[PDB]
């Protein structure tokens, strides 16, 4: 509250520590559905069903440009990229299977660089 704060955890190497995070997603070999936003014009229903899109490549600019404020709206983004996956895509088909193993992938990279 006013004047009363719980010790400072060092948030300094955040910037850094997600930008290697996300270079890891970048170069997965299933980050392939993920890597570039979802072609709205050639895919029909996509624009419609899925309210906020977003993929690794839009993720980067943000990170680059400063539009997260804090290393959770960064996971919030991440995660939005694999509930927009399920969303759309059945569990039992190429890109189905893609989000799924990405999402693990990332979850642990998460937990172990700030958990």
């Given at each position: ?25 970048e170069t997965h070999e299933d980050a392939w559905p993920?890597?570039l936003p979802v072609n709205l014009k050639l895919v ?72």
């Amino acid at each position: 509250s006013m004047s009363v704060k719980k010790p400072k955890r060092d948030d300094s190497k955040d910037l850094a520590l997600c930008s290697m995070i996300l270079t890891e997603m970048e170069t997965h070999e299933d980050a392939w559905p993920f890597l570039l936003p979802v072609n709205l014009k050639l895919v029909p229903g996509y624009k419609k069903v899925i309210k906020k899109p977003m993929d690794f490549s839009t993720i980067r600019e943000k990170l680059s440009s400063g539009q997260y404020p804090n290393l959770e709206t960064f996971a919030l983004d991440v995660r939005l990229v694999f509930d927009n996956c399920e969303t759309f895509n059945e569990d039992d088909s190429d890109i189905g299977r893609a989000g799924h193993n990405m999402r693990k992938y990332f979850e642990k990279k998460w937990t172990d660089t700030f958990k």
